[PDB]
Amino acid sequence: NRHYYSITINYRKNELEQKMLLNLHKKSWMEGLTLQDYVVKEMLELAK
Amino acid sequence: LLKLFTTMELMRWSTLVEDYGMELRKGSLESPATDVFGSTEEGEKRWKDLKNRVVEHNIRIMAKYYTRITMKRMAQLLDLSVDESEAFLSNLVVNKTIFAKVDRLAGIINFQRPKDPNNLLNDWSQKLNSLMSLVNKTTHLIAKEEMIHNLQ
């Protein structure tokens, strides 16, 4: 700790990108187009 | 005969009998004919197994429109008789290399596939893959419509 005192850090106000850091993410990470599974049988067969 | 390698050429058997009996009537290379139909205990047996060919390969090719077909109209669309078709059904069906289902309860039965006894699997494939094709529709709809709208 002598010669090493830590400094409070933080991240930037990133909305300038955080917007595009979630918009594109949420839109894609969630079925992209989202018109895809709308898997529905073979999955519940094994499920049940 | 090379054309026969597609659609089976469900041809009037006597027409092919012409096409391959005039081989013996060749004013040219005819040793083909004698190797094929200049023979009797096998050449005529070659005609017989050729009947076998036409019937069984027609069974092969016609497997599409089935699940409704009559024993009589079978022969009608077979270029061979009904009890001829009876023996052909018999041999191909005890050979049973394919799985059909037939009965003279009606005689209207067919050289079928498993006759679709399946559950949702059919519906599953259909719904899922079709809907998927539809999302593909959308995803290239945007693209190609934009492309045709590029100049504008």
Query: Per-residue DSSP letters for A1-48?
Result: -TT----------THHHHTTTTHHHHHHHTTTTS-S----SHHHHHH-
Q: Count CB-CB contacts under 10 A for residue B79.
A: 19
CB A22 within 8 A of CB A29: no
Which residues are bridge partners to B110 per DSSP?
Answer: B101
CB B68 within 8 A of CB B75: no
**Data resolution in angstroms:** 5.7
Distance CA B36, CA B24 (A): 9
3-state secondary structure of B88: helix
- Backbone φ and ψ for B62, nearest 5 degrees, come out as -85, 15
Contact B132 A35 (CB under 8 A): no
Contact A41 B128 (CB under 8 A): yes
A→B contacts (Cβ < 8 Å), by residue, are: 33, 35-42
**Cα–Cα separations (whole angstroms), residue B117 to A40, B70, B111, B120, B123:** 20, 21, 16, 10, 12
- Judged by a CB distance cut-off of 8 A, whether residue B128 touches chain A is yes
Distance CA B152, CA B146 (A): 9
Question: How far, in whole angstroms, is CA B128 from its chain's centroid?
Answer: 30
B46 DSSP assignment:
H
- Backbone φ and ψ for B101, nearest 5 degrees, come out as -150, 125
CA dihedral (B49, B52, B58, B60) in degrees, to 10, reads -100
**Cα–Cα separations (whole angstroms), residue B66 to A19, B113, B116:** 58, 8, 12
